[PDB]
């Protein structure tokens, strides 16, 4: 049993900032990597970054460096994504994903429900 | 078709040791006894030694320069003629040959131990000391 309970759904204006959350369950949150993915209709799915708990190490995608931040609460097992400045191009549904077998991160077997964000 | 694939030996300091093997298949290794000879590169063949027949003593006889230097053994279970060459000098070199010695004798001109002959040899294996 692996379940990523994602939370958000907030309508935002351009120029403002957004934050959404992803609570992990079933698997031990500390020893497995998380990734953040964005899906926009008619556009390429862009991988935004990954977060490793046990140190909270972060790797942000190059197009979004300086605008995206990913942090976490180990005790609530909850990863948090934040975008400092949205635009019209940020209209998309955001997914908190996990590798099928973290040993190899890039097999997104487990996905969240999806968080639409409209700008 | 008695294939005698002998493969072993190589570069080594003036003092040292090494271990040559002489396989054999296609005849009766169990009693026919075998010999080693050395041919230094700027020289002809020179006789080294030969195991004696199993049941014919099973002993070895070294040569005039080689006595006290080499040692010959046979594992007939696996048809392998090993030669340990140790306490090396510089003249020790060449395409060391392993061949299947024979026993030849006849009356009239009889004289112990008679003579032997080297019919089926191997291809060769280069050994050179530095």
């Amino acid at each position: 049993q692996v379940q990523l309970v994602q939370s958000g759904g907030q309508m935002k204006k351009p120029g403002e900032s957004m934050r959404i959350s992803c609570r992990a369950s079933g698997y031990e949150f500390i020893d497995c990597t998380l990734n953040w993915i964005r899906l926009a209709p008619g556009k390429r799915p862009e991988w935004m970054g990954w977060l490793k708990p046990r140190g909270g190490a972060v790797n942000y995608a190059r197009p979004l460096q300086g605008r995206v931040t990913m942090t976490r609460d180990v005790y609530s097992d909850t990863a948090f994504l934040e975008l400092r400045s949205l635009t019209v191009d940020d209209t998309a549904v955001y997914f908190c994903t996990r590798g099928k077998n973290c040993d190899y991160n890039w097999d997104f077997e487990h996905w969240g429900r999806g968080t639409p964000v409209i700008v | 078709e008695v294939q005698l694939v002998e493969s072993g030996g190589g570069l080594v300091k003036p003092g040292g040791s090494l271990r040559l093997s002489c396989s054999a298949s296609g005849f009766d290794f169990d009693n026919a006894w075998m010999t080693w000879v050395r041919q230094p590169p700027g020289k002809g063949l020179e006789w080294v030694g030969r195991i004696t027949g199993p049941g014919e003593g099973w002993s070895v006889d070294y040569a005039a320069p080689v006595e006290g230097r080499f040692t010959i053994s046979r594992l007939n279970s696996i048809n392998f003629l090993y030669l340990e060459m140790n306490n090396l000098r510089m003249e020790d070199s060449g395409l060391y040959f392993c061949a299947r010695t024979g026993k030849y004798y006849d009356f009239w001109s009889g004289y112990p131990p008679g003579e032997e002959y080297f019919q089926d040899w191997g291809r060769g294996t280069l050994v050179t000391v530095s």
Binding site: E46, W106, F108 | -
Partner: protein, 98 residues
């Protein structure tokens, strides 16, 4: 780095759907399906291996850098949007319709 076959592919139920994804880089390639209004699923992983719970109809691979996914005998649950991942990348995304 990654390209795909046309994104307006339209087939009725029952036929075989061929989805081609060309990849420039080396790496394990996975295939994802997205249903309308639901999160994507991992359909193929490591190029040729099906995910758990996926029927045998989803299969296909190619030695060279041109992977082909074959979807035989489409049902009503198919006809989503298909993506091809290689590490971070996902490609254009091709829809399958009726």
């Amino acid at each position: 780095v990654l390209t795909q076959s046309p994104g307006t592919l339209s087939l009725s139920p029952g036929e075989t759907a061929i989805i081609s994804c060309r990849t420039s880089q080396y790496g394990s390639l996975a295939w994802y399906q997205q249903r309308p209004g639901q999160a994507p699923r991992l359909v193929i992983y490591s190029g040729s291996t099906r995910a758990a719970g996926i029927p045998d109809r989803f299969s296909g691979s190619r030695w060279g850098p041109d992977y082909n996914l074959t979807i035989s005998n489409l049902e009503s649950g198919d006809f989503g949007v298909y993506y091809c991942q290689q590490y971070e990348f996902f490609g254009q995304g091709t829809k399958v319709q009726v």
